[PDB]
Amino acid sequence: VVPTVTMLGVMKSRLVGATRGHALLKKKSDALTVQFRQILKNIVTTKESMGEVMKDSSFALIEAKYVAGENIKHIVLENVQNASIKVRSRQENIAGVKIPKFEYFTDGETKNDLTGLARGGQQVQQCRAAYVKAIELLVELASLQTSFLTLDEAIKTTNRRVNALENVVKPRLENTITYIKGELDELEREDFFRLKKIQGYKKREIERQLASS
Amino acid sequence: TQIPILTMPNDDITHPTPDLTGYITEGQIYIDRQLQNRQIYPPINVLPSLSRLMKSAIGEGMTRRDHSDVSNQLYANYAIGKDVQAMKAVVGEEALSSEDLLYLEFLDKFERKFVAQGAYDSRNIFQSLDLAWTLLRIFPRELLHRIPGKTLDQYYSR
Amino acid sequence: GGDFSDPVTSATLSIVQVFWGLDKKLAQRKHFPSVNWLISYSKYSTALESFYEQFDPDFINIRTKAREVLQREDDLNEIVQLVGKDALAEGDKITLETAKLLREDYLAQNAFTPYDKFCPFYKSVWMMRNIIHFYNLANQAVEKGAGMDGQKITYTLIKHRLGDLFYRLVSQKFEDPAEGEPALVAKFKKLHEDLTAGFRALEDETR
Amino acid sequence: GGDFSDPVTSATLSIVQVFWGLDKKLAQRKHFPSVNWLISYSKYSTALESFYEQFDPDFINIRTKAREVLQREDDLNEIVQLVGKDALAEGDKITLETAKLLREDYLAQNAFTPYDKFCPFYKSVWMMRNIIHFYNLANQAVITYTLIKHRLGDLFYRLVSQKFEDPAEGEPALVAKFKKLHEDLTAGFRALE
Amino acid sequence: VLLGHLDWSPMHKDPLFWRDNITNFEENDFQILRVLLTILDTSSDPRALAVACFDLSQFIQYHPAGRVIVTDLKAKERVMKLMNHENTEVTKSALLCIQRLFLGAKY
Numbered sequence: 012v013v014p015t016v017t018m019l020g021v022m023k024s025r026l027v028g029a030t031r032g033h034a035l036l037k038k039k040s041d042a043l044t045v046q047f048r049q050i051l052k053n054i055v056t057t058k059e060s061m062g063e064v065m066k067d068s069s070f071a072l073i074e075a076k077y078v079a080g081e082n083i084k085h086i087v088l089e090n091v092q093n094a095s096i097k098v099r100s101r102q103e104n105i106a107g108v109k110i111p112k113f114e115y116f117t118d119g120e121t122k123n124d125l126t127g128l129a130r131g132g133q134q135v136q137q138c139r140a141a142y143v144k145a146i147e148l149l150v151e152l153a154s155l156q157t158s159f160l161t162l163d164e165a166i167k168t169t170n171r172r173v174n175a176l177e178n179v180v181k182p183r184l185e186n187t188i189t190y191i192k193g194e195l196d197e198l199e200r201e202d203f204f205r206l207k208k209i210q211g212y213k214k215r216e217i218e219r220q221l222a223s224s
Numbered sequence: 225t226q227i228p229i230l231t232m233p234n235d236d237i238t239h240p241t242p243d244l245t246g247y248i249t250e251g252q253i254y255i256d257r258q259l260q261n262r263q264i265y266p267p268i269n270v271l272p273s274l275s276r277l278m279k280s281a282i283g284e285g286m287t288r289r290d291h292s293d294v295s296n297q298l299y300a301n302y303a304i305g306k307d308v309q310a311m312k313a314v315v316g317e318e319a320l321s322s323e324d325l326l327y328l329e330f331l332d333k334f335e336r337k338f339v340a341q342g343a344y345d346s347r348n349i350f351q352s353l354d355l356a357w358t359l360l361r362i363f364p365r366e367l368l369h370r371i372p373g374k375t376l377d378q379y380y381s382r
Numbered sequence: 383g384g385d386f387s388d389p390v391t392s393a394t395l396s397i398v399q400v401f402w403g404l405d406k407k408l409a410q411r412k413h414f415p416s417v418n419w420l421i422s423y424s425k426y427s428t429a430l431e432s433f434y435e436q437f438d439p440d441f442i443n444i445r446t447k448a449r450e451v452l453q454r455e456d457d458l459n460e461i462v463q464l465v466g467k468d469a470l471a472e473g474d475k476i477t478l479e480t481a482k483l484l485r486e487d488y489l490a491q492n493a494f495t496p497y498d499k500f501c502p503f504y505k506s507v508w509m510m511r512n513i514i515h516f517y518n519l520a521n522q523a524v525e526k527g528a529g530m531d532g533q534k535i536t537y538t539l540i541k542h543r544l545g546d547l548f549y550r551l552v553s554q555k556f557e558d559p560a561e562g563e564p565a566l567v568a569k570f571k572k573l574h575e576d577l578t579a580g581f582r583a584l585e586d587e588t589r
Numbered sequence: 590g591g592d593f594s595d596p597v598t599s600a601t602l603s604i605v606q607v608f609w610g611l612d613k614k615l616a617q618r619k620h621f622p623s624v625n626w627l628i629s630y631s632k633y634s635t636a637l638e639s640f641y642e643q644f645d646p647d648f649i650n651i652r653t654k655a656r657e658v659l660q661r662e663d664d665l666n667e668i669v670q671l672v673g674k675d676a677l678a679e680g681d682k683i684t685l686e687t688a689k690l691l692r693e694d695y696l697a698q699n700a701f702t703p704y705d706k707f708c709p710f711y712k713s714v715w716m717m718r719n720i721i722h723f724y725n726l727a728n729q730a731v732i733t734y735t736l737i738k739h740r741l742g743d744l745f746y747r748l749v750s751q752k753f754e755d756p757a758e759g760e761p762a763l764v765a766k767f768k769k770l771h772e773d774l775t776a777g778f779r780a781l782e
Numbered sequence: 783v784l785l786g787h788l789d790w791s792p793m794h795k796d797p798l799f800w801r802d803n804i805t806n807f808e809e810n811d812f813q814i815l816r817v818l819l820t821i822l823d824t825s826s827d828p829r830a831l832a833v834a835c836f837d838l839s840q841f842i843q844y845h846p847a848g849r850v851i852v853t854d855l856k857a858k859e860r861v862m863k864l865m866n867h868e869n870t871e872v873t874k875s876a877l878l879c880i881q882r883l884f885l886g887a888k889y
Binding site for chain 3: 167168171175176186190
């Protein structure tokens with residue numbers, strides 16, 4: 012870019028703004044990383060639900076098999092009284108990230124039931140009780156994925172600003188400072204020094220001419 | 225005692241006169257353009273401003289005992305409030321904790337009730353420190369980490 | 383210091399017509415010609431239009447195509463320096479492709495080898511025609527491949543199924559002109575025909 | 590503004606052999622010595638090594654180990670910054686803890702306190718030995734870091750106490766107390782392994 | 783914990799509060815208590831360690847399993863350092879902590 016005092020001021024302002032924006036983006040990325048760590052911890056904690064509720068559902072299934080032998084299956088698939096599975100979605104916002112929220116049958120709205128099997132009460136209390144845990148796990152996984160993507164984007168932007176933009180601007184500021192002070196200021200003194208030399212030469216010539224008379 | 229008023233051209237300190245007088249003196253009380261735009265009559269940017277030997281003025285015989293404590297607490301709390309406002313500009317302000325809102329309201333009160341002194345509202349240092357304590361007492365007594373003991377018990381009770 | 387704001391350089395460029403500017407970065411990367419194709423310029427391209435026309439009608443157009451490819455490569459590099467190699471359009475990927483080839487196989491010259499000490503003009507013409515033909519065939523495949531996935535995303539597949547012709551394109555610069563003018567022109571023509579047939583068949587196979 | 594680019598600064602750095610580098614960041618963090626270990630250097634150590642070894646041949650090796658620990662301190666710093674202390678190994682955790690102890694117990698002075706107003710070279714050498722030797726003896730045992738931390742928890746408080754020793758008792762008495770704590774720390778390190 | 787300042791107050795020298803607080807800590811083996819044990823091991827204020835030792839003692843007496851864990855925890859290491867430490871009040875509280883773990887190890 013062309014070096015000038017106004018250009019130097021503009022470059023300094025751009026560097027200051029870049030530093031401020033980098034700090035703000037680092038803060039946002041840190042907050043998003045904290046939220047992602049919390050979501051990962053929650054998912055790890057709720058992973059054990061997928062084992063506990065599964066064991067309970069297996070026990071209920073064994074009890075139902077011992078009660079009525081082979082389930083009807085086929086047309087109605089049997090094995091349950093609840094869980095008319097229908098899923099509804101919601102969008103929450105955390106640190107500017109649109110974290111989805113999930114609700115479904117036996118874990119929210121859109122649920123219905125009718126009759127059931129012999130142990131259908133037990134099956135609902137164990138096999139259909141895992142529905143809430145599954146919905147929570149799915150919501151946690153979706154939130155973790157969204158947070159990971161947002162954190163990756165923010166970290167890429169922050170790293171680019173720290174490495175490329177600021178280190179691009181600062182050499183530009185140094186070159187602009189050098190071009191002005193290193194050349195224009197030096198030339199101004201040299202021009203004036205040569206002018207003073209011309210004046211001194213004129214005075215000396217006048218004095219010598221007067222003395223020769 | 226000198227309080228020379230110097231104009232810094234182009235609103236920067238790199239100018240030869242301010243940069244030259246910086247070494248000779250021992251302080252800098254900047255007037256900030258944005259605060260003037262924000263219509264705060266004394267636009268003194270307190271956080272950038274400092275006195276290289278402000279410790280001598282603070283003391284027991286002169287002034288009041290709690291001067292240094294309240295000064296440091298105000299400094300730190302202002303910085304925190306500015307940082308929290310910057311964060312709320314980008315985090316949507318929904319995720320801010322209670323302490324973040326406390327610092328936000330403290331920053332607003334400090335800008336609109338403390339700095340914005342009237343052109344003729346003469347304030348003795350004692351009532352100025354009373355105002356400082358009024359702003360400070362919003363935070364819990366345990367939250368004012370920078371304040372030493374035996375001072376909170378003295379003044380935090382109002 | 384390399385800055386082109388020096389009084390000598392400014393006064394020279396104020397009157398000189400053709401200007402082969404050089405970049406220190408390319409010299410650092412052992413490029414050797416070091417001619418920065420983005421800043422250099424030649425005002426004499428207008429006068430030599432008659433010579434180009436009586437030589438080859440293709441060159442006047444493939445030159446513009448190559449210049450456009452270079453400008454697009456510069457813009458893409460500027461974008462990817464911060465966005466990242468992902469999320470690039472397959473057309474943009476095909477543009478960066480053969481732009482790397484033009485950089486490392488056409489403009490680059492060793493200048494201390496039996497092959498790159500001298501280079502006849504029409505040899506460079508055939509090199510440019512081959513590179514532009516590769517670019518045009520790739521973008522023709524991008525335009526229509528019996529589906530968007532089969533049209534443009536297939537560049538990775540091309541990098542393998544067409545790898546031999548790509549290697550021959552990048553290695554066609556290694557042949558010394560001292561090996562006989564008809565020999566080199568025949569080799570260039572054979573390479574062009576082989577690449578054309580192979581890529582046309584691949585674009586006409588399974589799509 | 591702290592920018593070591595002015596011609597005065599550049600010439601001084603080019604001529605001066607030893608630059609100590611006081612840092613305002615440490616002063617903000619309430620550091621009495623305020624000497625930034627990351628930027629200070631002593632180009633005369635090679636010539637001083639004769640006296641350093643004559644006083645104690647192990648002192649120069651201790652200094653080299655301390656320099657290595659300081660170099661690894663920033664490494665562990667970004668390690669904790671990016672993933673946290675969890676990913677640190679038992680040896681890595683021990684190294685980080687020893688670096689923190691060195692920074693907050695020996696690399697820092699207390700000036701105003703009568704016990705740390707003046708630090709004799711004897712007391713400094715014994716403190717450096719009692720720190721580095723303990724660091725190694727804990728290092729080669731890698732033992733669970735948490736298990737080592739619980740066993741050495743009293744020792745960590747004792748190391749701060751070893752620094753708290755006054756020079757009034759005389760150099761030998763302070764040296765013997767530093768040695769006794771070091772010997773007890775070493776005995777805990779080897780017997781418990 | 784959140785303030786990080788340990789002061790004695792009327793409910794921290796009272797047994798009843800600790801009994802209702804035991805359950806709230808459990809989140810990964812008294813995770814709040816484990817963080818408090820880490821706070822007892824390392825604290826910003828020397829004065830805080832003395833009240834911290836008071837607080838720990840009460841939970842361990844109430845929870846025999848907690849007392850054995852406290853001896854394993856770095857809080858016992860902090861108590862051992864406090865036993866080899868000046869200040870009468872810190873030493874009293876430290877001694878009471880040691881004894882609380884001890885009653886439970888051997889029956």
